[PDB]
Design a protein around this ligand. Sequence first.
Ligand SMILES: Cc1cc2c3c(c1C)C(C)(C)CC=[N+]3c1c([nH]c(=O)[nH]c1=O)N2C[C@H](O)[C@H](O)[C@H](O)COP(=O)(O)O
Ligand SMILES: Cc1cc2c3c(c1C)C(C)(C)CC=[N+]3c1c([nH]c(=O)[nH]c1=O)N2C[C@H](O)[C@H](O)[C@H](O)COP(=O)(O)O
Ligand SMILES: O=C(O)/C=C/c1c(F)c(F)c(F)c(F)c1F
Ligand SMILES: O=C(O)/C=C/c1c(F)c(F)c(F)c(F)c1F
Ligand SMILES: [K+]
Ligand SMILES: [K+]
Ligand SMILES: [K+]
Ligand SMILES: [K+]
Ligand SMILES: [Mn+2]
Ligand SMILES: [Mn+2]
Lengths: 500, 500
Amino acid sequence: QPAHLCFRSFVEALKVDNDLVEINTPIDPNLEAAAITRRVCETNDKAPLFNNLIGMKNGLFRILGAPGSLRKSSADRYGRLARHLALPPTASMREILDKMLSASDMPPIPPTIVPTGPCKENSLDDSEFDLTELPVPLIHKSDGGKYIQTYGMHIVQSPDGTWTNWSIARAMVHDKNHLTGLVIPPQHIWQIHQMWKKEGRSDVPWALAFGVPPAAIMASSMPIPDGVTEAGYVGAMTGSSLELVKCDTNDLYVPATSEIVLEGTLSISETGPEGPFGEMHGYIFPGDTHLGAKYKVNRITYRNNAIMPMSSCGRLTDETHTMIGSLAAAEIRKLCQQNDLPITDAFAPFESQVTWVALRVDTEKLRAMKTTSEGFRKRVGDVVFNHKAGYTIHRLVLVGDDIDVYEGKDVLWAFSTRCRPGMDETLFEDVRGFPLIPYMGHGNGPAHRGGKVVSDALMPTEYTTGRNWEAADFNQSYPEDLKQKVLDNWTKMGFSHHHH
Amino acid sequence: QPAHLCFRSFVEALKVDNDLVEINTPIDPNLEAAAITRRVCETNDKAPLFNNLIGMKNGLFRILGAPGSLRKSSADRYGRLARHLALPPTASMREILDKMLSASDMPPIPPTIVPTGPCKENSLDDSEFDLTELPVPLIHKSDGGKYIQTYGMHIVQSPDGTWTNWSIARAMVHDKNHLTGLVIPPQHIWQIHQMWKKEGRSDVPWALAFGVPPAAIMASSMPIPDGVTEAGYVGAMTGSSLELVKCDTNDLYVPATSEIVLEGTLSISETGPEGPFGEMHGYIFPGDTHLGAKYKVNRITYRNNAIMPMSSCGRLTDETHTMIGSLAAAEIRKLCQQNDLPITDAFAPFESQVTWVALRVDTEKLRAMKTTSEGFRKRVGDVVFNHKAGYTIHRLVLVGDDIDVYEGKDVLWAFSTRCRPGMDETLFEDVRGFPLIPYMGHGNGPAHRGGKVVSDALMPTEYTTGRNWEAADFNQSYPEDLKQKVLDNWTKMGFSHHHH
Ligand SMILES: Cc1cc2c3c(c1C)C(C)(C)CC=[N+]3c1c([nH]c(=O)[nH]c1=O)N2C[C@H](O)[C@H](O)[C@H](O)COP(=O)(O)O
Ligand SMILES: Cc1cc2c3c(c1C)C(C)(C)CC=[N+]3c1c([nH]c(=O)[nH]c1=O)N2C[C@H](O)[C@H](O)[C@H](O)COP(=O)(O)O
Ligand SMILES: O=C(O)/C=C/c1c(F)c(F)c(F)c(F)c1F
Ligand SMILES: O=C(O)/C=C/c1c(F)c(F)c(F)c(F)c1F
Ligand SMILES: [K+]
Ligand SMILES: [K+]
Ligand SMILES: [K+]
Ligand SMILES: [K+]
Ligand SMILES: [Mn+2]
Ligand SMILES: [Mn+2]
């Protein structure tokens, strides 16, 4: 099976790429696996495959860390993401995001049901498993639980059957047969949960599949529109219908090659302690436990020699940056364009801890709009910050066509030099805020409202007659023939490879 | 003579450090020298010494580019600055700034007058030189003149004789015997100029010395207090009285080993076209010429085989970042401490284009103040933004003790995650602004007023009971013994030198 369609094949691909370290000696799921993975992520090293996890029994489980993190070289920096999508390992972030947006003006390709798959190789009923006995990692030393779920896909379906959502939301072990996790607005797992609560008749049928097709985990991490079934979006993106098998204890369908599947229910009534967790912004607040959603597990099925993916998230750079930020930015770009805004590109700079999105403006279009900064900032901010795709993003930085928004140095240069604090910004206090940012949920104001800003780093003439500067840099401050001479004579004079 | 006391010795030291490329073939001062230097600065390469400058005649002149720019390795990143100060080449930025502040609570050591020095080896009277015939560089292709003066020291003295200021301010050739340059408030060259204008009786006696003692050019770039003679501050910092020789045509005194000296007058009445120039923030606005101050040159003296230092300034990283930003930050740190503010460290992040200063707060002291963010931000901003040391800085970022302000990644992390836009900031519109920032002088508001902000990246409990988080990073999220195990086993497992 191709790597983008099968997690086991994906692991092989990382090995073949020389992007994998297999660790065959015993590794403790209590902090050690996650510490190694954390160091990987902070250094852009090879992904760790823990083949000999202390506490593994009867095939549950090995761990792959850092599935969507960065490689060291510039040339294949995003190669791990490219391997989720059948793209060349040298693919640019623009190409990755375009691939992830491509299904948005395609017909869905619904999934295909097949009678069995590797995810049925082994099973454990409700008398045979105990979640507290599995080698579930403690990821950060102050976490409030063992976070089994950092890179699996929750599957829930609307009561009427018409929308099946796939998404990543964290969850931790509560007891032998339950998890607790975050289920918060405006996320689709929350929106579906609310539909079941209002019906009031039963708990939500649920499954959690780990080690799913890589292209599916990418869509699981992306804020595609309300009501859109991820399976059919992934089918259209990949050009192939995904093969799914029915759960044994409910009528949900899971990817046939899933490594591990939990089947059960998400309660419409019960809660339990959840968190704290070392989160995407780089912090944990020890002792900050709050009530979260509660899941009951009735059945586990799994592949022979099952592998659990894990994100050891926190400070730069991991899946919470590469996937959450970039995929939100992609959806924002599209949303802006659909609202007739002249946005060509969007990216969440890593330097901002993916709390900013830089929006590249087609300034020729802007000029034809015959508008002003105040008006344009307000329009952009209303579109983005009133939409779910803007949820996680607290600052939008508008930049003109000279800036490559995928290069954080250039975004920071433009922000710092072209946006006058205050005057060139519009604050938004009456929009939904992202409570997980420390200055929100642990800050001075409402955790759930406001704290957003549009920062205009467009210069005045970009609205009127066109750019009126040149950069004071090697590229723009010297003629072509001179630059080329300098470059040709560089090593000859005494001064100091792309791939590496 | 030691390197910090003699520019010629400084050049030798760079050679001995393997931090110099001597270019002995012909190089054009029309853009080529500056293009090479620009590429050096953008790549942290070795400093270029242009020994064979097209248009050099009778000893005027060779060029050294990039005198205060960065080296590639982390270990000696600031080595060129350390060589200005007699510090080891591995000196930290903290150590460099502390050296530059050290003279602030020392008695001055006034200069010593000697009868001659190398700067008298050659001379040209007013019938023998023409500034338009010298190999003065065109530094950026759109510059409005040939900027002879990018790393020399202007010398002017108050009418009463009591204060002699040394400072860097740009200047360009106007004609055979005049320069034009920037002389703007609140700079000390401007303040002295105003004293002469109010007296109304004569032009200001002036000299411009190029290739001065490196320790003197560093103080020339620093906003030490009003009324303080730089020569005596440099004497105290270095522990030695500087040796100066009298000008021939006026009674000012110049460093004995200056490479090149211009003697003349800064007019109290006349102006001429000045600029545009590719500036510290990374831009040039072609065609933006305005009237500047006008200098008349009466005499040139110079060393045999004179060397002119040059800054090819613009986008990161050059002397306008390493020296302007860092030295302002140092003076701000001191100013804050003298105003009883609990500031331990300050630095201007390069990522901000040195328009921010991050201020590290001693949060134990803060807690004893029993204050709030609103109050504290206002107090810090009033102290800094009402003072000349704050002139160039438009954003202050307050951070707690965990943040190393000399590491821009960490400042950006703290700013983006701990300062709620709007709520945690105080805007200052009634303070002097720095017009050279594009969003000021080419922006939407007054060029000279406002546009400043204090951004509080202190978290709420840092004012009250103490930090209540741990970072979700390798350092803080795992116990000591585990980290050390991981590190010890790193290469054994299969994962990937300080000097490099
Ligand atoms: C990649 C990724 C995405 C996380 C995520 C993580 C990763 C690795 C974790 C597991 C390591 C840490 C926490 N995460 C949560 C999360 N969204 C959410 O509501 N709760 C979470 O707990 N997300 C983001 C969520 O997947 C995106 O917002 C999706 O758009 C949600 O899909 P939906 O649009 O269908 O609701
Ligand atoms: C290092 C450095 C400092 C420049 C500078 C440059 C460099 C290389 C240039 C020459 C390449 C470009 C322009 N610069 C000017 C400048 N200050 C100023 O008023 N006008 C300038 O034109 N400065 C900053 C000035 O030296 C500091 O603000 C000092 O504090 C001024 O000394 P003072 O406090 O005695 O007034
Ligand atoms: O646990 C964490 O670090 C991230 C939780 C998280 C997320 F990353 C998101 F993008 C969300 F939209 C969301 F609602 C979340 F709760
Ligand atoms: O020409 C340039 O790029 C810088 C001019 C400049 C400067 F760098 C400063 F720090 C000043 F304080 C100042 F007044 C200036 F004019
Ligand atoms: K999704
Ligand atoms: K602007
Ligand atoms: K000075
Ligand atoms: K704050
Ligand atoms: Mn969805
Ligand atoms: Mn001074």
